[PDB]
Design a protein around this ligand. Structure first.
Ligand SMILES: [Zn+2]
Length: 257
């Protein structure tokens, strides 16, 4: 049962999921004195106005806000991409104290948490087919910097008491995922992987340069979730981040530089 504790955490994942030691694993440190420009890169296009959130679910690893991805209500295009990517869900990673918790780092700096907006390439018909392809998935990562409380985020945090344990779900309508974005969408990109098992090497990462905020009090709420199901031994989600993995000569590109 993979997790984040000392016996089942990231340093052990390679036993059941050997791709953990792969060529294109995520997250990574983004060293900003090593980032390259590429005139092929474009502005990020996030078309989220019509998005329809459905529900929030404690999956035993984090919690996911699920979207209707049966059509193009919430899509990602451009940036480094060459197709149309539908938003299926977003979730977060966070740490046990506010000084740590992001998966990506920027010149070794750790934010308090990181938002992952997970998308899949429509041409593959569904998420599972897409997850097996190098160009199949695209994840937008947004740092959460501890400081000012964030009203958009509060709406997510207000629902977490309804999904405290694994397998619980709650209705969650009308949440605009764009409300969790910075105003300007400058980004870094590189080829990588999912940051949880199965760790599949199918993700084009788009990591936004500008964090959104979170308060220290808000951060407490993330840590109240339970990894386990009702009636099982409790183990709170105090931390659920994978550390930086080796870049292995992949190119990190930046837009606009
Ligand atoms: Zn994630």
């Amino acid at each position: 049962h993979w997790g984040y504790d000392k016996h089942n955490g990231p340093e052990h994942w390679h036993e059941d999921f050997p791709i953990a030691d792969g060529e294109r694993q995520s997250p990574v440190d983004i060293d900003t004195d090593a980032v390259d420009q590429d005139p092929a890169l474009k502005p990020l296009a996030l078309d989220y106005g019509e998005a329809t959130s459905d529900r929030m679910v404690n999956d035993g690893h984090s919690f996911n806000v699920e979207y209707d991805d049966s059509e193009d209500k919430a899509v990602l295009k451009d940036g480094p991409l060459d197709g149309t990517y539908r938003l299926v869900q977003f979730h977060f990673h966070w740490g046990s104290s506010d000084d740590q918790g992001s998966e990506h780092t920027v010149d070794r700096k750790k934010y308090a948490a990181e938002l992952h907006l997970v998308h899949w390439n429509t041409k593959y018909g569904d998420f599972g087919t897409a997850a097996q392809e190098p160009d199949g998935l695209a994840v937008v990562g947004v740092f959460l910097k501890v400081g000012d409380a964030n009203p958009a985020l509060q709406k997510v945090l207000d629902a977490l008491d309804s999904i405290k344990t694994e397998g619980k779900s709650t209705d969650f309508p009308d949440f605009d995922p764009g409300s969790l974005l910075p105003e300007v969408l400058d980004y870094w990109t590189y080829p990588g992987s999912l940051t949880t098992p199965p760790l599949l090497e199918s993700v084009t990462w788009i990591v936004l340069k500008e964090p959104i905020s979170v308060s220290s009090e808000q951060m407490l709420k993330f840590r109240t979730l339970n990894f386990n199901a009702e009636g099982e031994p409790e183990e709170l989600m105090l931390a659920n981040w994978r550390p930086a993995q080796p870049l292995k000569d992949r190119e990190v590109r930046g837009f606009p530089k």
